[PDB]
């Protein structure tokens, strides 16, 4: 009644080594409905959007899951946007968009369970530089910003996990957040784990061994997910993520499904 028996089952399907390239899937609205795009560009997600168009289907959204990053997404148009439900709460995932894609090359070279992601330095230092510009808007442009690593938890959210080609990479983004902002390339030591935690429901999954050849990955980082830690100050932004809803609250932030009611009544002086 308190320590109730939970039978951790184990269903075993027939598992080949299948390809995996996510295509853009855009959601249309049925007949008699519409979708209201928010064509603003300072739009922080909430509040009154002053320029609203009406479209039936949205842009080709790519279902690209990851933790701690948002690969192959869609970009901003003016500056780096910083969205949150309630900022100054220290329990809400601060989303971040990029108006320029920090390209990341990631390959398994020729150990089978080892890979490397290469990201270009100073395209990252300026993009960490753009973020500490708009971050100081919600603060007192002081209280020295210190990026740092994660804190712990599962291995899926303390490292930038993704899945390119069919294998489930786990990259140690620890050089990407090590600076502190007062008032050539980088290499990341990825693995390929076979025993992962599913993001779908609660449970573990063990997969086939990695494929034999080379595994390329050309993804364009268009987004972060940070998190603060309110002490009693420097406001350290320890990155995270992992609820997969937040990967699609950053490509469905400018949309709204309404219902069209085309019958109105009014008083007139007719006869």
């Amino acid at each position: 009644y308190r320590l109730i028996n939970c039978n951790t089952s184990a269903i075993t399907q027939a598992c080949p080594k299948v390809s995996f390239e996510p295509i853009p899937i855009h959601y249309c609205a049925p007949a008699g409905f519409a979708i209201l795009k928010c064509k603003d560009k300072k739009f922080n997600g909430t509040g009154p959007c002053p320029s609203v168009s009406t479209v039936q289907c949205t842009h080709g959204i790519k279902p690209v899951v990851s933790t701690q990053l948002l690969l192959n997404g869609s970009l901003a148009e003016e500056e780096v946007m910083i969205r949150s439900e309630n900022i100054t709460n220290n329990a809400k995932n601060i989303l971040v968009q990029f108006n320029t894609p920090v390209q990341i090359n990631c390959t398994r070279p020729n150990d089978i369970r080892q890979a490397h992601c290469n990201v270009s330095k100073a395209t990252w230092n300026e993009t960490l530089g753009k973020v500490v510009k708009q971050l100081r808007k919600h603060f007192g442009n002081n209280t020295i910003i210190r990026f740092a690593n994660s804190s712990g938890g599962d291995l899926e959210v303390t490292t930038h996990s993704f899945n390119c080609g069919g294998e489930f990479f786990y990259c140690n983004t620890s050089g990407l957040f090590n600076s502190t902002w007062i008032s050539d390339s980088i290499t990341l030591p990825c693995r390929i784990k076979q025993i992962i935690n599913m993001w779908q429901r609660i449970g573990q999954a063990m997969y086939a061994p990695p494929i034999q050849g080379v595994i390329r990955c050309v993804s364009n980082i268009t987004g972060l997910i940070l998190t603060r830690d309110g002490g009693s100050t420097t406001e350290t932004f320890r990155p995270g993520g992992g609820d997969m809803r937040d990967n699609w609250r950053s490509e469905l932030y400018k949309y709204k499904v309404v219902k069209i009611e085309p019958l109105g009544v009014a008083p007139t002086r007719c006869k």
């Binding site: 007949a31 008699g32 519409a34 009406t54 039936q56 069209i260 085309p262 009014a266």
Partner: peptide, 18 residues
Amino acid sequence: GIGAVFLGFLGAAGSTMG
């Protein structure tokens, strides 16, 4: 076909009812 005109009603929102 007809679902094109079901959304074209909304071109007059934001204006005044006259």
